[PDB]
Amino acid sequence: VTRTAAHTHIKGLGLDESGVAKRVEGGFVGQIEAREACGVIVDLIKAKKMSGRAILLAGGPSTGKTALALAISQELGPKVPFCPLVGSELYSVEVKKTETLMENFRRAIGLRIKETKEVYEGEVTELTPEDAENPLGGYGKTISHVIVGLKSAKGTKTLRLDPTIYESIQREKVSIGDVIYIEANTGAVKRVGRSDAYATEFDLETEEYVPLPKGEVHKKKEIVQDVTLHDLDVANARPQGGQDVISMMGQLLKPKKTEITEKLRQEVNKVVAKYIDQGVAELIPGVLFIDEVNMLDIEIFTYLNKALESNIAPVVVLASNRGMTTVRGTEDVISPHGVPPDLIDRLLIVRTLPYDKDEIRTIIERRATVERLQVESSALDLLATMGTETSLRYALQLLAPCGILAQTSNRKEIVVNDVNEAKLLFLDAKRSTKILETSANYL
Amino acid sequence: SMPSMDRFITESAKLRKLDELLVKLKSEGHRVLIYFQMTKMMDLMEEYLTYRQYNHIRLDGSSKLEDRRDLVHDWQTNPEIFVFLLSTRAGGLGINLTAADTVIFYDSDWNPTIDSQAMDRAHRLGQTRQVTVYRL
Amino acid sequence: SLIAAHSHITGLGLDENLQPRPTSEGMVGQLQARRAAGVILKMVQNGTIAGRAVLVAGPPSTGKTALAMGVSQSLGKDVPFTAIAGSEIFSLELSKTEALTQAFRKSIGIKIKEETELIEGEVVEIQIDRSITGGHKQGKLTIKTTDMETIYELGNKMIDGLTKEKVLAGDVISIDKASGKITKLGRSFARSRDYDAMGADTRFVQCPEGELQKRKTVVHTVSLHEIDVINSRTQGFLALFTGDTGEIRSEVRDQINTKVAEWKEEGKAEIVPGVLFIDEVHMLDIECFSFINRALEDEFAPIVMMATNRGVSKTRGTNYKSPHGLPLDLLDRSIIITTKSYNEQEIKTILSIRAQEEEVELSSDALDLLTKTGVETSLRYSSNLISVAQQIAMKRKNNTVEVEDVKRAYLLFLDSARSVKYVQENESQYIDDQGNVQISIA
Amino acid sequence: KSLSLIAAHSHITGLGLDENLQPRPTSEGMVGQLQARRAAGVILKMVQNGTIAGRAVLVAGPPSTGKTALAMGVSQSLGKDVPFTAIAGSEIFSLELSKTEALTQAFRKSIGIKIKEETELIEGEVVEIQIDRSITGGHKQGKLTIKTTDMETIYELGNKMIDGLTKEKVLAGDVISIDKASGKITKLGRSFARSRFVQCPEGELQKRKTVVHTVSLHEIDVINSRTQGFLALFTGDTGEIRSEVRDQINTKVAEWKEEGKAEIVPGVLFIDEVHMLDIECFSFINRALEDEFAPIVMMATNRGVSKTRGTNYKSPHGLPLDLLDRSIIITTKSYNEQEIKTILSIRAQEEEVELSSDALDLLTKTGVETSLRYSSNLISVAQQIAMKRKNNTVEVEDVKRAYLLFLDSARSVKYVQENESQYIDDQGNVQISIAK
DNA sequence: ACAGGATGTATATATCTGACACGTGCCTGGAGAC
Ligand SMILES: Nc1ncnc2c1ncn2[C@@H]1O[C@H](COP(=O)(O)OP(=O)(O)O)[C@@H](O)[C@H]1O
Ligand SMILES: Nc1ncnc2c1ncn2[C@@H]1O[C@H](COP(=O)(O)OP(=O)(O)O)[C@@H](O)[C@H]1O
Ligand SMILES: Nc1ncnc2c1ncn2[C@@H]1O[C@H](COP(=O)(O)OP(=O)(O)O)[C@@H](O)[C@H]1O
């Protein structure tokens, strides 16, 4: 029916109203202390008061680190911006890594704005331009004004435009008998389609047929918009959407990342604070999630120390699975989790713990019942012993070949023989290393 | 991007199922009556009808008493009319609607007494074919 | 288009119970690996699960790339199969994660339903009105069939399609409304007055009858990466061919994912996942593996297949050694298929199939000698010797490869071990690792 | 103005000093560090005098001992219209600029030019608009009635003022501001008529407005280079401005200062984590400090006798000795327990957190035991644990619960070392299996 | 002091009349020249 991929049996942290966690709730099994700590972090994010609070999730492989961050994102809801990331993604070839980190910092602070629009709309009834006296004079356009007659439901208006608006109108290829939509905030013109007041079946260019727009031609409507700070920074750094030459040629050239200056961010902050002061906008801080944080080097860590101390930064969540490893970009610095001690001093570490046989067995039960598979009890116990012997993920990933081998024998139940056949056909890391060690020519 | 009729159709499940059987009902060459309850239950549906450019008229008692005299006459005389909208008690009381069989109830669940007169206006003497009642 | 290395493999050679035949569809031997690949093929064909990694490992010249070619051949049409090598990721205009993202998104196809109208008829009169500079174009087209006759209206691109492949009021054309394609089927009126400004020899077709306009439904498949590149900027369709798509932003991908889910909701489009095959995966950085570990957990992820032929080797970008050259966190979330080396009967059957593919007649003794030298040396060397021996036998004006031709080819063209021995016997004549060589022979 | 949630240094409003540059024990959100605060006050007076250029000051000490807080207090005490540039060390390793070019841009962003100018503005409340149009449209006549609370007048408009009033549509009852020379009309809002909302202006309609401008040297360098527009100040791709366009700016600024048309306002450039710069950057700084148009540079680092980047030897504070010869060093010391308690009380007061005395004693004890920053971070977590139990104040049990839930560095190191088989080490070895 | 049956409320509809609106034909007093 649907598609399942390594997750999506997790819907939330599954906590009570007082913060205590049920053992089996929300798709989670075990990890009670980590779930309660993540609930405290979720409440801290929902308080919307703090800036630059950073935690770190530490533990071994297959212990439930990224599942907790995904559960945090599901608990917060879609109105809070959540920016997933991998530590290898900060190494770009177009811009420096510091700018990529600051862009992903600004991408995690949302904004809700109740803005208003001025709209002229209706069906075009006439289109007559008036020429200039000296067309070849070098200065000034060919035309001077264009008379446009618009007709809507219980209304009719006549408009006199400059050549600037008419240039965008004729760029939209507007004829007589079309329904248009002029937005006065930017001069943008949208051609909705042919009107249905005329014949329909005599066209050859797959158009759509639109009724007459209701209400008057001139209108004022309120639109609720959800944007981030990075959207404003990008739209101001590379200007598009105006009717001038510079914003028109900006849509045609190839886009490229640029080092946004601090002055532009300060001006955008000033304008956004002015919008909030009028009661129009409202700030929604969010979460930045950097997975595999050991891939970063010392320069990004040293810039992260500076960037966490700013007065706008969101809540940062990191994850790592290294014991005591050298930091990348250095030679002698040995630190826990691959994170330097000055950054470790600014964190709050949440420990994650390994599982047992019972938790592995019920996790296999949950993953089997998510994937619409029916497993026998003896096969379930065999898979639980397999998971404790080798790996949890190897037992989880062997469910679908077992189901296929059961289906190819015209059967619905998964039995022990299917699990034995899947053991024979597919290997794991330890048996592959055993084959690699006793082999002739670098297998 | 302007609000899209399709997304308007597909975001409502009742209208989604309504658009399916109407295609084969038109392909059969038939006559359809649909009953309604709210204003906007019959203020959004003719947008869908004009999207399908179906021949339709709307009858309710908010309209004047003169129009009910000739709307029923134009329904019973013209065969090219396809869709006849209605409220509960506006035309389900004494109106001769023997030219159609398929009555479709959008939300007629108010009382069985009201619905028992509703198909009484259609399933009447003079019908020459089978009556298929669809309750949604 | 030419005779290639894996041109003799057409499928996997399996039954309905996924039991591999001993010799079928150009594949011999390797029953467990073929059965496992058939299970993976059924897993792709079901299309209900995402982000599963399969690793194919073994010694060199064993049939990993042959197995991947068999999987891609049995996968069928219109299902994407992206095959890349490990060294294509390192680019000068794209980061490694961006190139890996594009390679992941190229392997998911979107099948879109479309409604079109087909218009075929006989052209009566064309009127085209253009401005003085030729910018604005509009006009009316009068087309007809044997029963009906209609006057249409034309736009800019319809007029541009009519000006090319010039129609001369009596040609029979067919128009697709959604595609916008003009096809001139032929000439039916056969007019008398013809001026010498045209040199075509247009065919005599009949005037079509029946309905002028028909309704048709068409289905086409477009990958996710094409949709991203098209929606990225103004002229993205050229960048689909020139490769000038530099680091598409994440907002584009988020909005495309939401729009694709919306199209799936309305019944307009459906999702057909495919296979991404990364051959020679050991030539990848540690950052690529760290990206793959999180890219496999997404909703829109294909079935990733990797192949390698390394033992406990050094991982690139690190200073330690790992099994297969891959780190253990990636190996935890992968499923390993192991391939075995070949017998002599399998080698003889391989050589016979490759000889039949290259259209070479072989004797029994020549095949036995080729089997013996393919057992002693590698298999690929004895497979390469076949065409050379065929040319040598063709030089003597007989179309049958004999033992003397195989001996001559073995004499002329060397092996790896023979070349290593000849280098080590005369090491002063070659340039050493210290750059010393005796060029004088005295 | 200046939107912000809560910063890590938000409680500091400046250096706590009297008129004789002596530090109070607690003032303006700064606790302790008397000698460092006195030295920073001397440096602030040196910046305020403005007769001394190109002096380098190094702030060194252990981590989490008031180093960035001192520079934050200096930047607060500097006031407005004096440039302050704060960059990290790893921000100059760019892809489109060389390191010396980025350092030159950061140096020239901290020198300002103060220009005062005069202009004529008309700002009032629009009473009535009369616009008559001919059939041919050859000429436009008009009359504009505008008023303040003290005056009333009626104007006769020309053609282009009529065109500039039709554009940016002005109705009756609006409050607008008109520039005569440039022709720019700004709608300040709507006057108090209920039928955004701004009070009616007072006094004269025609007024003289003196505006004091402050332009950095970098802006003049960008503008005077004709290959780039002024949009490079916002997009950021100035792209290695040529050397010969800077001497013209220097000579012109010297000429303007001689003629009395402008004044030079020097500022402070602050480099945080200075140990991440290369040796070439230090060699460039050695000559860039000796210029006349050079600001006062404050650098901060916490390393001690480490390897200088780009070399293969070790040097004190990670800096070579020729740069340390050009600097005067301010040294910070570790904190006492009473100062830790006062700092934690100030941080709890900033976050409007009510603490019991026993909770404050527990936080002070665990701050002496582990870290100041860990005890600072625990307050906001324990507050949310307190709101989970539906009480306002923060008790001892909430602090103990937060201490149990969230670990520190030493406990995490202990848990890693006790179970190092389950983690990935430097050799890439791990044991994911539970049994055997 | 509590239960049970009355109205009260809400939140949509529905039909239907009441007291305003707007639109049109056509004459006599306003406009122009003197
Ligand atoms: N408590 C749990 N309940 C259910 N599934 C879990 C739990 N913990 C881990 N898993 C599963 O085990 C896998 C662990 O991978 P993940 O948590 O993403 O990163 P890591 O491998 O570093 O722990 C995930 O696929 C997740 O679905
Ligand atoms: N079972 C098989 N059927 C057909 N050809 C095979 C088979 N096994 C190997 N080959 C041949 O061997 C070569 C493939 O070897 P190779 O690509 O090196 O495998 P791998 O890359 O996995 O080591 C191809 O020339 C192929 O024709
Ligand atoms: N004298 C002080 N007064 C107020 N707060 C201080 C003082 N010293 C340190 N702090 C606080 O301690 C924390 C760490 O100090 P900081 O100077 O930022 O780090 P570092 O010393 O490593 O540069 C900051 O949040 C700061 O507010």
Subunit contact A371:C49, Cβ cutoff 8 A: yes
CA D59, CA D328: separation in Å to the nearest integer?
A: 9
For residue D190, what are the CA distances in angstroms to A340, C152, D173, D256?
Answer: 56, 55, 6, 42
CA A233, CA A329: separation in Å to the nearest integer?
A: 31
**A167 token code pair:** 């240039």
Question: Cβ contacts of residue C338 below 8 Å, gap of 6+?
Answer: A427, A432, A435, C33, C57, C58
Subunit contact A200:B53, Cβ cutoff 8 A: yes
Contact D7, A49 (CB under 8 A): no
Residue A138 DSSP code: S
What's the distance, CA A161 to chain centroid? Answer: 41
Nearest-CA residue for atom 17 of ligand 1: A64
Question: Cβ contacts of residue D106 below 8 Å, gap of 6+?
Answer: D85, D87, D92, D269
Helix, strand counts (H, E) of chain D:
14, 16
Helix (H) or strand (E) holding A424: helix A416-425
CA B123, CA B109: separation in Å to the nearest integer?
A: 19
For residue C164, what are the CA distances in angstroms to B23, C62, C170, D114?
Answer: 40, 54, 16, 67
**C352 token code pair:** 């016979």
Q: Any known ligand binding at A59?
A: yes
Question: Cβ contacts of residue A23 below 8 Å, gap of 6+?
Answer: A29, A30, A32
> C314 to chain D, minimum CA–CA distance in Å?
11
DSSP output for A221-275: EEEEEEEEHHHHHHHHHS--SSSSHHHHHTTTSPP------HHHHHHHHHHHHHH
CA D85, CA D91: separation in Å to the nearest integer?
A: 13
> Could you give the 3-state DSSP secondary structure of residue C35?
helix
For residue A317, what are the CA distances in angstroms to A52, A64, A288, A293?
Answer: 11, 14, 6, 10
Using a CB–CB cutoff of 8 Å, tell me whether D34 touches chain A: no
CA D256, CA D250: separation in Å to the nearest integer?
A: 10
Measuring CA to CA, which residue among B118, B117, B93 is closest to residue B103?
B118
Experimental method: cryo-EM
Whether residue A35 has its Cβ less than 6 Å from ligand 1? no
DSSP output for B16-79: HHHHHHHHHHHHHT--EEEE--SSTTTTSHHHHHHHTT--EEEE-TTS-TTHHHHHHHHHHH-S
CATH architecture for segment(s) D116-211: Beta Barrel (2.40)
Measuring CA to CA, which residue among D393, D380, D394, D387 is closest to residue A17?
D387
Place of tokens 């990694």: C53
> D93 to chain C, minimum CA–CA distance in Å?
18
Round to a whole number and report the distance in Å from the CA of B107 to the C1' of E12: 14
Which residues does chain A have within 8 Å of residue D412's beta carbon, measured at their own beta carbons?
58, 336-337, 349, 351
Contact A85, A319 (CB under 8 A): no
Measuring CA to CA, which residue among C256, C281, C278 is closest to residue C269?
C256
CA A424, CA A439: separation in Å to the nearest integer?
A: 19
Place of tokens 């920053």: D373
* Residues within 6 Å of ligand 3 by CB: D 8-9, 29-33, 63-69, 302, 343, 372-373
Pairing relationship of beta strands A349-351 and A54-58 according to DSSP bridges:
parallel
Which residues does chain D have within 8 Å of residue A95's beta carbon, measured at their own beta carbons?
95
Measuring CA to CA, which residue among B23, B46, B24 is closest to residue B34?
B46
Half-sphere exposure of C110 (CA within 13 A, CB side): 24
Q: Which of A190, A192, A211 sits opposite B50 (nearest CB)?
A: A211
CA D63, CA D71: separation in Å to the nearest integer?
A: 15
User: DSSP alpha helices (H): ranges in A281-415?
Assistant: 298-307, 341-344, 357-370, 377-389, 392-397, 399-407
Fold of the C113-218 domain: OB fold (Dihydrolipoamide Acetyltransferase, E2P) (2.40.50)
CATH architecture for segment(s) D337-416: Orthogonal Bundle (1.10)
Helix (H) or strand (E) holding C54: strand C53-57
Residue A135 DSSP code: T
**D63 token code pair:** 């981590």
Q: What is the dihedral of CA C391, C393, C396, C398, to 10 degrees?
A: -110
User: DSSP alpha helices (H): ranges in A308-398?
Assistant: 341-344, 357-370, 377-389, 392-397
Residues 42-101/B with CB within 7 Å of nucleic chain E are: 42, 60-62, 65, 87-90
Subunit contact A89:C39, Cβ cutoff 8 A: no
Contact A221, A118 (CB under 8 A): no
For residue C136, what are the CA distances in angstroms to A170, C132, D326?
Answer: 10, 9, 73
Measuring CA to CA, which residue among D408, C329, D431, D413 is closest to residue A354?
D431
**D145 token code pair:** 């009635």
CA A374, CA C48: separation in Å to the nearest integer?
A: 16
CA C324, CA A431: separation in Å to the nearest integer?
A: 13
Pairing relationship of beta strands C53-57 and C303-308 according to DSSP bridges:
parallel
> A172 to chain D, minimum CA–CA distance in Å?
24
DSSP output for C2-20: ---TTTT--S--B-TT-PB
**A94 token code pair:** 């177009």
Half-sphere exposure of C351 (CA within 13 A, CB side): 31
Helix (H) or strand (E) holding A111: strand A109-131
**D156 token code pair:** 């006769």
What's the distance, CA B112 to chain centroid? Answer: 19
| Max Cα distance, chain C (Å) | 98
Q: What is the dihedral of CA A397, A403, A404, A407, to 10 degrees?
A: 180
Bases on strand E under 7 Å from any protein CB: 12-17
DSSP output for D351-419: TT--B-HHHHHHHHHHHHHT-HHHHHHHHHHHHHHHHHTT-SSB-HHHHHHHHHHSB-HHHHHHHHHHT
CA D34, CA C126: separation in Å to the nearest integer?
A: 95
Residue A109 DSSP code: E
CA A389, CA D233: separation in Å to the nearest integer?
A: 61
CA C419, CA C433: separation in Å to the nearest integer?
A: 17
Measuring CA to CA, which residue among D314, D366, D358, D376 is closest to residue D337?
D366
Contact A287, A314 (CB under 8 A): yes
Q: Which of A261, A302, A322 sits opposite D233 (nearest CB)?
A: A261
Q: How far is the CA of A319 from the centre of ligand 3 (A)?
A: 26
Whether residue A28 has its Cβ less than 6 Å from ligand 1? yes
Q: How many CB atoms lie within 10 A of CB A322?
A: 22
Nearest-CA residue for atom 14 of ligand 3: D64
Q: Is C355 left (phi over 0), alpha (psi -120 to 50) or beta?
A: alpha
Q: Is the dihedral of CA D24, D27, D33, D37 positive or negative?
A: negative
Which residues does chain B have within 8 Å of residue A211's beta carbon, measured at their own beta carbons?
47, 50
Place of tokens 């197995």: C67
CA A338, CA B22: separation in Å to the nearest integer?
A: 65
For residue C413, what are the CA distances in angstroms to C375, C404, C418, C421?
Answer: 17, 14, 10, 14
For residue D354, what are the CA distances in angstroms to D339, D379, D423, D432?
Answer: 19, 10, 40, 45
Please give the single-letter amino acid code of residue A81: P
**C260 token code pair:** 């694709």
Measuring CA to CA, which residue among A310, B19, C82 is closest to residue D3?
A310
Q: How far is the CA of C61 from the centre of ligand 2 (A)?
A: 6
**D174 token code pair:** 């609006």
Question: Cβ contacts of residue D158 below 8 Å, gap of 6+?
Answer: none
DSSP output for D174-243: EEEEEETTT--EEEEEE-S----B-PPP-S-SEEEEEEEEEEEHHHHHHHHSTTS-TTHHHH-------T
Subunit contact A181:B53, Cβ cutoff 8 A: no
Q: Which nucleotide is nearest to B38 (CA to C1')?
A: E13
CB pairs under 8 A between B and C: 6
Nearest-CA residue for atom 6 of ligand 1: A64
Q: Any known ligand binding at C302?
A: no
> Searching chain B, which residue's CA lies closest to the CA of residue A209?
B51
Mutual orientation of helices D34-49 and D67-78 as an angle, nearest 10°? Answer: 40
- φ/ψ of D33, rounded to 5, equals 55, 65
Q: Which of A192, A196, A200 sits opposite B2 (nearest CB)?
A: A192
Subunit contact B6:C266, Cβ cutoff 8 A: yes
Contact C9, C38 (CB under 8 A): no
CA B14, CA D408: separation in Å to the nearest integer?
A: 57
CA D230, CA D219: separation in Å to the nearest integer?
A: 8
Residue count of chain B: 136
Place of tokens 């930017």: A186
What's the distance, CA D152 to chain centroid? Answer: 45
Contact C11, C74 (CB under 8 A): yes
DSSP output for C327-385: -HHHHHTEEEEE-----HHHHHHHHHHHHHHTT--B-HHHHHHHHHHHHHS-HHHHHHH
> C372 to chain A, minimum CA–CA distance in Å?
20
For C110-130, give one letter per residue: b (16+ CB within 10 A) or e: beeeeeeebbbbbbeebeeee
Residue count of chain A: 443
**C234 token code pair:** 């103004």
Helix (H) or strand (E) holding D107: helix D99-108
What's the distance, CA A333 to chain centroid? Answer: 35
Helix (H) or strand (E) holding C312: strand C312-314
Q: Any known ligand binding at C327?
A: no
Question: Cβ contacts of residue C212 below 8 Å, gap of 6+?
Answer: C119, C120, C121, C143, C144, C145, C147, C148, C149, C150
The residues facing C27 across adjacent strands are: C24
Round to a whole number and report the distance in Å from the CA of B110 to the C1' of E8: 22
CA A240, CA A260: separation in Å to the nearest integer?
A: 16
Subunit contact B2:A190, Cβ cutoff 8 A: yes
Pairing relationship of beta strands A178-183 and A109-131 according to DSSP bridges:
antiparallel
Contact A75, A19 (CB under 8 A): no
Contact A22, A16 (CB under 8 A): yes
Contact A25, A14 (CB under 8 A): yes
Contact A342, D63 (CB under 8 A): yes
> Could you give the 3-state DSSP secondary structure of residue C269?
strand
Residue among D58, D301, D372 to mutate when testing ligand 3 (max atoms within 8 A of CB) = D372
Q: How many CB atoms lie within 10 A of CB A362?
A: 17
DSSP output for C100-148: HHHHHHTTEEEEEEEEEEEEEEEEEEEEEEE-SSS-SEEEEEEEE-SS-
User: DSSP alpha helices (H): ranges in A28-139?
Assistant: 32-47, 65-76, 97-106
Please give the single-letter amino acid code of residue C129: D
Which residues does chain A have within 8 Å of residue C234's beta carbon, measured at their own beta carbons?
251-252
CA C73, CA A285: separation in Å to the nearest integer?
A: 51
Nearest-CA residue for atom 19 of ligand 3: D64
**C334 token code pair:** 């992968």
Using a CB–CB cutoff of 8 Å, tell me whether C153 touches chain A: yes
CA D340, CA D363: separation in Å to the nearest integer?
A: 9
- φ/ψ of B27, rounded to 5, equals -65, -30
For residue D103, what are the CA distances in angstroms to A146, C383, D91, D237?
Answer: 54, 63, 10, 15
Please give the single-letter amino acid code of residue C98: E
> Could you give the 3-state DSSP secondary structure of residue D60?
strand
| Mutation for testing the B interface, residue in C215, C217, C266 having most B CBs under 10 Å | C266
**C236 token code pair:** 């993205």
> Could you give the 3-state DSSP secondary structure of residue D71?
helix
Give the A window 345-404 contacts with C, CB below 8 Å. 371, 391, 393-394, 397-398, 400-401, 404
B125 touches strand E (CB under 7 A): no
CA D294, CA D108: separation in Å to the nearest integer?
A: 8
Mutual orientation of helices A377-389 and A357-370 as an angle, nearest 10°? Answer: 120
Contact D282, D319 (CB under 8 A): yes
- C344-423: what CATH class? mainly alpha
**D348 token code pair:** 């709890």
> C432 to chain D, minimum CA–CA distance in Å?
33
Round to a whole number and report the distance in Å from the CA of A406 to the C1' of E34: 118
